[PDB]
Amino acid sequence: SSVILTNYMDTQYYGEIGIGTPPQTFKVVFDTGSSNVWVPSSKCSRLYTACVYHKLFDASDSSSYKHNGTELTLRYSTGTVSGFLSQDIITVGGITVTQMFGEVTEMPALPFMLAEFDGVVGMGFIEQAIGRVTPIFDNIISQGVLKEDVFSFYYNRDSELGGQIVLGGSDPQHYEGNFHYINLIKTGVWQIQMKGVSVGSSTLLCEDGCLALVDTGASYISGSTSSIEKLMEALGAKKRLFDYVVKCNEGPTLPDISFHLGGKEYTLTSADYVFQESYSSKKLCTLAIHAMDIPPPTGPTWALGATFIRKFYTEFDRRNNRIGFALAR
């Protein structure tokens, strides 16, 4: 089974899921960095403008809904949502599963007013699930219908298909060459060992090793504040409140950035990480690499998001606790 994804400005990749009977439709991001499912709730005060601007789940319109009510708060890197748990049937890519998910009643304008999607579907392990709620992928596996306990992500370039998730395998149509796997450091987290990060000609980063969280829900490739400061200084980039910029005319001149993973070098060109909006020296162009301090126990750690996945088709293998990469087609 595959899920068709929409690509919004190269920063938000989302697909549709249906909740309830009759189905209530929601745009959601599939995030390997978290493990809970959530959508905005009809019980969310309209004082939260983000709730006024998104699809709201109304339990009183679903005959398959099952009440629970346990309160839950979900804390992400860029924001927080709070609400309560509910159960209902969820349709994802043709598969139907009963699932416990969050009905959000508090959703801050910043950053959710800037969200194209309505909610999130955690693709992480149950070990990271808040409130110990069984993750949707564990529930699907329990049905014993998938041919493989693995799911794969394909994120297309902005263009204007936006992207695609395959539940149960991989799509040969969107990758070439063969996969090269890296074993997970531990079950419970889609995190892997990274042997090093090189910029141009000088592996001046992640010497002695570091961690890499393969995060489909992250728009960019991120590193700790210290690591990014070095990487950026090397790039000649200036720091701003929420990102790093470079004078556009110099975007094409930026050096390659490479990521040593499992005995293979994964290299990005400047075209791969800079939002080349123009070429003027009087304009600033943002970079798809940010500074993000991810808290323990998962962090500190680098995060390989869309910027990376766009270049490399990614397969998450639950049966063998490994992650595979292959050149995206």
Side-chain angles (χ1 to χ4, degrees), residues 1-159 161-329:
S1 297
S2 63
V3 181
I4 299 284
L5 309 179
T6 291
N7 175 173
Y8 166 75
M9 312 183 99
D10 260 8
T11 63
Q12 297 172 37
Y13 290 81
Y14 60 87
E16 276 199 1
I17 66 170
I19 305 188
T21 307
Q24 293 175 227
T25 284
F26 296 91
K27 296 180 226 285
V28 293
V29 171
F30 295 80
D31 177 20
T32 54
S34 55
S35 309
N36 293 73
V37 176
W38 73 263
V39 291
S41 169
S42 65
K43 294 186 64 185
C44 175
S45 169
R46 305 312 146 93
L47 277 307
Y48 283 105
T49 310
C51 283
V52 169
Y53 281 73
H54 286 90
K55 176 65 83 65
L56 305 180
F57 176 72
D58 196 327
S60 65
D61 287 332
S62 170
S63 55
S64 49
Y65 160 84
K66 294 295 209 303
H67 167 271
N68 181 282
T70 295
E71 190 180 307
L72 91 166
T73 294
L74 281 30
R75 65 292 165 278
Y76 299 87
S77 302
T78 66
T80 304
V81 291
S82 197
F84 59 94
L85 290 178
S86 291
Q87 183 193 81
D88 202 332
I89 58 179
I90 289 182
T91 295
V92 195
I95 296 178
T96 298
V97 292
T98 293
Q99 176 76 214
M100 258 290 187
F101 62 100
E103 273 195 67
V104 171
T105 55
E106 299 174 308
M107 179 173 72
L110 271 60
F112 296 95
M113 272 302 288
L114 297 174
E116 252 275 291
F117 54 96
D118 303 298
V120 181
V121 167
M123 297 295 281
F125 301 76
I126 189 170
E127 289 83 312
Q128 299 308 303
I130 301 301
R132 295 305 307 296
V133 175
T134 308
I136 200 168
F137 197 71
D138 286 316
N139 278 164
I140 297 183
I141 284 178
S142 292
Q143 296 184 174
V145 301
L146 292 181
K147 244 59 277 170
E148 294 193 61
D149 267 45
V150 319
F151 52 97
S152 304
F153 280 71
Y154 165 65
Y155 280 171
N156 200 177
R157 282 95 193 301
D158 192 0
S159 183
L161 72 172
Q164 166 203 267
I165 298 175
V166 183
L167 269 17
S170 286
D171 190 348
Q173 200 82 58
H174 290 120
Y175 71 85
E176 39 179 36
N178 26 56
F179 282 107
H180 290 98
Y181 308 80
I182 306 81
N183 292 73
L184 294 176
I185 277 178
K186 168 61 180 62
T187 298
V189 192
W190 293 114
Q191 199 176 207
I192 63 172
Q193 181 71 202
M194 176 151 67
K195 303 185 205 302
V197 180
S198 57
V199 169
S201 196
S202 63
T203 301
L204 40 71
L205 293 170
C206 173
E207 330 75 359
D208 303 339
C210 61
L211 308 74
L213 189 265
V214 184
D215 200 355
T216 59
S219 301
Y220 322 102
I221 284 185
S222 68
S224 71
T225 293
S226 299
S227 302
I228 299 311
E229 298 272 53
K230 276 194 161 297
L231 183 159
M232 290 296 157
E233 155 169 288
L235 291 186
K238 169 176 61 280
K239 181 176 183 169
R240 301 157 104 199
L241 217 193
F242 308 117
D243 65 0
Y244 278 85
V245 285
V246 107
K247 292 176 68 286
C248 300
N249 69 295
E250 31 182 44
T253 77
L254 305 193
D256 297 352
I257 305 297
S258 302
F259 300 81
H260 198 319
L261 305 169
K264 232 70 174 59
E265 288 294 344
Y266 295 84
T267 305
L268 292 197
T269 280
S270 70
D272 297 317
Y273 67 80
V274 339
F275 284 82
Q276 205 58 238
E277 220 86 71
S278 85
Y279 297 102
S280 166
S281 63
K282 300 178 184 302
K283 283 190 171 183
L284 300 175
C285 276
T286 315
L287 309 179
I289 300 170
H290 293 219
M292 188 161 97
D293 290 317
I294 302 178
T298 292
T301 181
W302 286 75
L304 304 173
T307 316
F308 190 87
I309 302 172
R310 270 198 285 282
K311 175 78 166 192
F312 306 103
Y313 186 90
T314 308
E315 180 187 66
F316 298 82
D317 188 341
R318 278 293 297 283
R319 187 194 175 191
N320 299 135
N321 290 297
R322 34 130 76 162
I323 289 180
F325 290 126
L327 238 202
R329 197 202 280 266

